[PDB]
């Protein structure tokens, strides 16, 4: 058994990460006390999910997550909420004062104060695993900790875990849900010094999750508690194989060996399916075949793009309920001759199946309906490139006339900076475009 | 149309199907980078209090 | 009150467009660099889809369909109706074509030639046309060396493919023609055929070399007893049904965040057995002088007005489909 | 824990910021010796940013009360509130500053300022972690202008990298106490392009305007126009006093919200404006809030372009409607919005409204247009200066001429400077 350490950095990352961690305890029967009753082993065991949750000598499982914010008001919900007993206080860092949507002010002025700390915390959990795998952090590109803090911690985590894998789940911005107009900035320079640091980043866009909201369940003005619950969903999917029995994506490796195969093209679209409103009088439950289909529909995608016109490099196929191989590969065989999935020619033209047999497991009183099978689609498309573009347009129009340059500049920060990370967004934009057309 | 690699357990199965074949900055490094923002910070905060005592 | 953005000042389709919409008071015009608009007049070349539908709010038209060049480009156009089967390799209005790159750069030089062999030894006509993307540059000869030659000395893709020999030529004159009809897509994938066309004939034996349906149907009954509409209106709507319906997959927009329609350009010729057969696809397109009112105007009433509404008997023949 | 010290200087200063603590004391159900008696514990989730708790459970505002005279704050411990203020913070002289911007910047003031330092010193000790400062005060006068700068200054050089917010009360000749207006507010001006972060612009010929025209008052007095002034600052102050998706400091808002350092003069509006009880729908909140006849800068926004819009609705409406109903205003007038800068229109929403309305909406702008009431003031400064006139009063306290040729060289280069942004 090898350990995971979630790490959760600024409001954006910890309250998803709080939703997340709500999620892992109803789908392990965790309850908020910390106490599991099926766990029959008490103090200890190297049972699946304690790749995710430690165990006292009292019997409670305390999850292997760190959250870090530069303002103690979002992380001090936590310390009161209703998981307050799952973790002790080390566990849970707050500051005084945030970085103002500054990625300078999160990075160099008040990271540098606050870096050793939080290295010091996740070496107490690392210090707990006898073979750690890696790290999950969850963060927001927007936020000037989620953007600033972040890639300082890769950097030092790249330091002092070298051999061990990083995956992120990344919040791209969207102006539907943010009061903030420096977002561009913040997730530019945020993607160029981190991108050396992680093997497998899932971005999710705000605007995707936004709109699914208000689509599927029916949610006229979606808040954030609304866009977590979905999010942890799609998050709980991608780390099932890590915290259950199974055979694909059994360690962060894997992720990176069957979604990357180029270093710097390692974010992989996700695709979720179905999403049911729990209110509706009672819906008709989805077939392999048509939750498989709806993987290619661009309305269920955390990133609003159109692989039609990209090239897959990857595909893996991860299923939670009743679902049997026969109905799989009956469902692929037909997607073939109706869609447009052009692989890259260096790359088989296959898809990576994994198959949980517990079915997603719902928050009581949520928004998502219980339904008997799920499938989560994760498929390395130059199509994501497109949100590259999107962001490195914002970033254009403001940068030409320096518009809030001088707040970055005010904290340390060098304007070269900025032009250097561009040039990098460049060079990656480049890096898709030579990968999918001809 | 081929299924290779089938694993089954008592929580799931995982297998793999094929439709055609195929055709770092050292911690100095980085003290340097947050000491060097830092000194910057510091040029400009005290040519404001040399405005501000003139 | 409606906005929209030209970035494409060279469209004389879309200019007359964009003349037309200022005149209802309802459309506003901004700058091509403004993107909180309704309706994009785009750029030929490099329009940004991803940019669009992402702008919170705003109903968001553009008047190009993202992977329609697969129908207009030369290579494009011979390799989907090879390779797609709605087309088949048998398709009987496409004249048999191969893709041919320069020797200085898959290709079918050694498929092209076993045919060609074919034809030579059968006593049959055996002349050819090779063109590409890049001209205004063509060459029709009877011998494959010069064919092949021809294209090493260029840099760019070729295609080759049969030169119909026999054109129906129109009486007085002796003279050849095309014939070019105007389609357009809407956003839900409605397929409308202009009900007005032009022939291009040729001022030589083989005004301002254009004639018109009226003219030219009605020559069709004096010279051959028949009309434009079984002998050849048939055909052509049913060549612009199989090409448009073979890559609706590809680039519909009905399940997307933005919303797409064009205008396309089909060149069709006719034989002495009034069968029909495809050039090319253009996928921007001028019109005829005499004509740019009536269509400009159909444009904005089902393209535009049909997503933007304002404050007949339809010009167009709608070809339905599944 | 994120505390704000409101500081009021002068006359002008003192009677808004007095009717600005009646206000927000009303809605966060404090009464006038210091006890809550609301009903939502909504009022007190951020009630410590504005107040300190004392024993007995009272709480007593965080403001500092300055003035070079008595008259103005006797009046203020006299008034309603006047009780509810801590009595150490009641700094004043008695020479006061015949509004003259040299005697509270250089001569009177100079001898008061260090005791008013001492109680900003005090109360920023007692705060959890201090957000930064925010003044109300006028610029045409002597103590609001001349010493409300120089305090201003000196506070930056105790803390630099805190937030300085003021809303600076602009003379109008329309409204005018004496002809030297245009000298002390230019001279002002300077100053706060320099050491402000943000500044809330509060044209006293708007105020007036607003009064005589839309609220249909014959005689408007300086207490009508301080409703205004009240009803704005409480509006502006909403996403700082109360709990909501926003999350919104002192410096979230500057980062978001000043593009470049010296453009930071912002344009407040507000709506309804009623001269009473028909419900107001979200359209119409939103058509009058963006109207020229709602903004107190007296400067035609359909003269500029906003850099920045950020607006607040008070009340329990349809937040559904509110994104349809700004959606549509700006992409009805996208040519009055930069489009350099993406998604500079924000929106923030408030369940507690203002006594006495179902709902209201509070505008901030950061437009070009501002520069218009720079230039009027650059005109009728240059007017008198061109012949020196009246000029013996500023240099007979020490002052020389050069000093008011940079000012003016300063403020029009802020006007041309938004100009170039303009286009
Ligand atoms: N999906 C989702 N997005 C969030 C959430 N919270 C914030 N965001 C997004 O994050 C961006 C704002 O960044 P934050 O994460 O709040 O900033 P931060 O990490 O706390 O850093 P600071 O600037 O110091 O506050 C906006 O684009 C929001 O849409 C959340 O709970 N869920
Ligand atoms: N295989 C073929 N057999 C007979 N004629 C042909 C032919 N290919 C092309 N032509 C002639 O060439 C003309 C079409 O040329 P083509 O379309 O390739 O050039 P082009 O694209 O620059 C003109 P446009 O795109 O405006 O129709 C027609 O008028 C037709 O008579
Ligand atoms: N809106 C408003 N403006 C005022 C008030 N009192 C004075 N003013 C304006 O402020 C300027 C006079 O400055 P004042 O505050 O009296 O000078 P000070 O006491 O020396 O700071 C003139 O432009 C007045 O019109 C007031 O109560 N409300
Ligand atoms: C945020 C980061 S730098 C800054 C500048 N603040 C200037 C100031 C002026 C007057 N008094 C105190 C401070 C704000
Ligand atoms: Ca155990
Ligand atoms: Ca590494
Ligand atoms: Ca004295
Ligand atoms: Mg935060
Ligand atoms: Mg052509
Ligand atoms: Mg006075």
Redesign the pocket.
């Known amino acids: 058994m090898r350990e995971c350490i979630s790490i959760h950095?600024?409001?954006?990352?910890?309250?998803?990460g709080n939703?997340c961690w709500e999620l892992y305890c109803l789908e392990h029967g965790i309850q908020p006390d910390g106490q599991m009753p099926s766990d029959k082993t008490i103090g200890g065991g190297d049972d699946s999910f304690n790749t995710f949750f430690s165990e006292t000598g009292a019997g409670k499982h305390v999850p292997r997550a760190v959250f870090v914010?530069?303002?103690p008001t979002?992380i001090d919900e936590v310390r009161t909420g209703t998981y307050r007993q799952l973790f002790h206080p080390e566990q849970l860092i707050t500051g005084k004062?945030?970085?103002?949507?500054?990625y300078a002010?999160?990075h160099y002025t008040?990271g540098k104060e606050i870096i050793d700390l939080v290295l010091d915390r996740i070496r107490k959990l690392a210090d707990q695993c006898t073979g750690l795998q890696g790290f999950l952090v969850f963060?927001?590109?927007?936020?000037?900790?989620?953007?600033?803090?972040?890639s300082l911690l890769m950097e030092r985590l790249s330091v002092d875990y070298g051999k061990k894998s990083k995956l992120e789940f990344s919040?791209?911005?969207?102006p539907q849900?943010?009061?903030?107009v420096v977002?561009p900035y913040?997730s530019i320079l945020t993607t160029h010094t981190t991108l050396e640091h992680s093997d497998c980043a899932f971005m999710?866009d705000?605007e995707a999750?936004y709109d699914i909201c208000r689509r599927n369940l029916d949610i006229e003005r979606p808040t954030?508690?609304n866009?977590?619950r979905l999010?942890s969903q799609i998050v709980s999917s991608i780390t099932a194989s890590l915290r259950f029995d199974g055979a694909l994506n059994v360690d962060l490796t894997e992720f990176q060996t069957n979604l990357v195969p180029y270093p710097r093209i390692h974010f992989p679209l996700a695709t979720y399916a179905p999403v049911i409103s729990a209110e509706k009088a009672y819906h008709e439950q989805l077939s392999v075949a048509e939750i498989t289909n709806a993987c290619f529909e661009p309305a269920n995608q955390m990133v609003k793009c159109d692989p039609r016109h990209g090239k897959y490099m990857a595909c893996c196929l991860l299923y939670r309920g009743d679902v049997v191989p026969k109905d799989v590969n009956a469902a692929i065989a037909t997607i073939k001759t109706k869609r447009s999935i052009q692989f890259v020619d260096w790359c088989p033209t296959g898809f990576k199946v994994g198959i949980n047999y517990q079915p997603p497991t719902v928050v009581p009183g949520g928004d998502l309906a219980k339904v008997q099978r799920a499938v989560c689609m994760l498929s390395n498309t130059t199509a994501i490139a497109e949100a590259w573009a999107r962001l490195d347009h914002k970033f254009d129009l403001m940068y030409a006339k320096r518009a809030f340059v001088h707040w970055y500049v005010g904290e340390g920060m060098e304007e070269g900076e900025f032009s250097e990370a561009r040039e990098d967004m460049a060079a990656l934009e480049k890096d898709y475009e030579e990968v999918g057309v001809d | 149309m081929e299924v290779i690699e089938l694993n089954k357990c008592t929580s799931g199965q995982s297998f793999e199907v094929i439709l055609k074949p195929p055709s770092d900055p050292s911690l100095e490094e980085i003290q340097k980078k947050l000491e060097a923002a830092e000194e910057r910070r510091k040029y400009q905060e005290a040519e404001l209090l040399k405005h501000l005592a003139e | 009150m409606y906005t929209f953005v030209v970035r494409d000042e060279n469209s004389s389709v879309y200019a007359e467009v964009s003349r037309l919409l200022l005149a209802t008071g309802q459309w506003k015009r901004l700058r091509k660099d403004n993107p909180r608009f309704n309706l994009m007049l785009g750029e030929r070349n490099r329009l940004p889809f991803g940019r669009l539908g992402h702008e919170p709010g705003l109903v968001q038209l553009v008047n190009y369909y993202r992977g329609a060049d697969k129908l207009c480009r030369k290579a494009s156009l011979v390799k989907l109706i090879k390779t797609s089967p709605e087309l088949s390799e048998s398709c009987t209005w496409f004249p048999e074509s191969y893709v041919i790159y320069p020797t200085n750069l898959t290709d079918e030089r050694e498929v092209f030639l076993a045919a060609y062999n074919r034809r030579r030894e059968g006593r049959e006509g055996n002349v050819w046309i090779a063109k590409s993307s890049a001209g205004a540059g063509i060459l029709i000869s009877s011998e494959a060396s010069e064919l092949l030659d021809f294209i090493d000395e260029q840099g760019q893709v070729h295609v080759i493919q049969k030169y119909l020999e026999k054109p129906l030529l129109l009486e007085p004159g002796h003279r050849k023609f095309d014939i070019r009809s105007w389609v357009l897509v809407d956003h839900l994938y409605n397929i409308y055929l202009y009900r007005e066309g032009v022939l291009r004939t040729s001022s030589e034996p083989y005004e301002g070399n254009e004639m018109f349906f009226e003219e030219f149907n009605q020559y069709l009954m004096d010279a051959l007893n028949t009309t434009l509409e079984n002998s050849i209106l048939l055909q052509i709507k049913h060549i612009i049904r199989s090409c448009l319906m073979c890559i609706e997959p590809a680039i519909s927009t009905k399940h997307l965040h933005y919303q797409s329609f064009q205008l396309f350009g089909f060149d069709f010729m006719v034989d002495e057995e009034l069968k029909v057969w495809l050039i090319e696809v253009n996928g921007a397109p001028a019109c005829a002088q005499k004509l740019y009112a009536e269509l400009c105007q159909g444009i904005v009433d089902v393209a535009i007005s049909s997503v933007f509404p304002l404050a007949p008997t339809s010009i167009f023949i709608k070809l339905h489909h599944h | 824990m994120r505390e704000i010290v409101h500081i009021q200087a002068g006359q002008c200063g003192n009677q808004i910021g007095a009717k600005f603590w009646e206000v927000i004391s009303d809605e966060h159900g404090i009464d006038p010796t210091g006890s809550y008696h609301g009903d939502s514990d909504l009022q007190l989730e951020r009630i410590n940013v504005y107040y300190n708790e004392a024993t007995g459970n009272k709480y007593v505002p965080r403001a500092i009360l300055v003035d070079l005279e008595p008259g103005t704050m006797d009046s203020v411990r006299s008034g309603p509130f006047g009780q509810i203020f801590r009595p150490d913070n009641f700094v004043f002289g008695q020479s006061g500053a015949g509004n003259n911007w040299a005697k509270g910047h250089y001569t009177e003031g100079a001898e008061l300022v260090d005791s008013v330092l001492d109680v900003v010193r005090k109360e920023s000790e007692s705060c959890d972690c201090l957000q930064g400062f925010q003044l109300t005060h006028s610029l045409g006068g002597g103590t609001g202008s001349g010493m409300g700068t120089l305090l201003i200054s000196k506070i930056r050089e105790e803390y630099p990298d805190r937030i300085m917010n003021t809303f600076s009360v602009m003379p109008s000749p329309k409204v005018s106490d004496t002809v030297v207006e245009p000298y002390n507010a230019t001279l002002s001006v300077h100053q706060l392009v320099e050491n402000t972060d943000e500044t809330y612009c509060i044209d006293n010929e708007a105020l007036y305007d607003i009064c005589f025209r839309t609220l249909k008052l014959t005689t408007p007095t300086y207490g009508d126009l301080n409703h205004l002034v009240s009803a704005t600052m409480s509006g502006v102050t909403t996403c700082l006093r109360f709990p909501g998706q926003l999350?919104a400091d002192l410096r979230?808002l500057a980062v978001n919200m000043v593009p470049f350092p010296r453009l930071h003069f912002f344009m407040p509006g507000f709506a309804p404006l009623t001269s009473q009880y028909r419900a107001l729908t979200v359209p119409e909140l939103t058509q009058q809030m963006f109207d020229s006849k709602n903004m107190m800068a007296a400067c035609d926004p359909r003269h500029g372009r906003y850099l920045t819009v950020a607006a607040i609705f008070r009340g329990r409406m349809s937040m559904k409607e509110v994104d349809e109903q700004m959606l549509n205003v700006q992409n009805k007038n996208s040519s009055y919005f930069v489009e350099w800068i993406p998604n500079n229109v924000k929106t923030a929403v408030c369940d507690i409204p203002p006594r006495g309305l179902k709902m209201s909406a509070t505008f901030i702008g950061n437009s070009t247009a501002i520069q218009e009431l720079f230039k009027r003031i650059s005109e009728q400064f240059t007017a008198m200066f061109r012949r020196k006139a009246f000029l013996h009063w500023y240099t007979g306290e020490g002052m020389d001429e050069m000093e008011f040729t940079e000012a003016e060289s300063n403020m029009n280069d802020l006007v041309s400077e938004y100009q170039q942004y303009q286009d």
């Open positions: 950095v600024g409001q954006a990352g910890v309250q998803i939703a914010d530069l303002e979002v004062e945030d970085a103002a949507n500054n002010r999160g008040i963060h927001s590109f927007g936020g000037g900790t989620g953007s600033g803090f972040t919040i791209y911005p969207a849900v943010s009061t903030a977002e913040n999710v705000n999750i954030y508690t866009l977590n999010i | 999350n979230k």
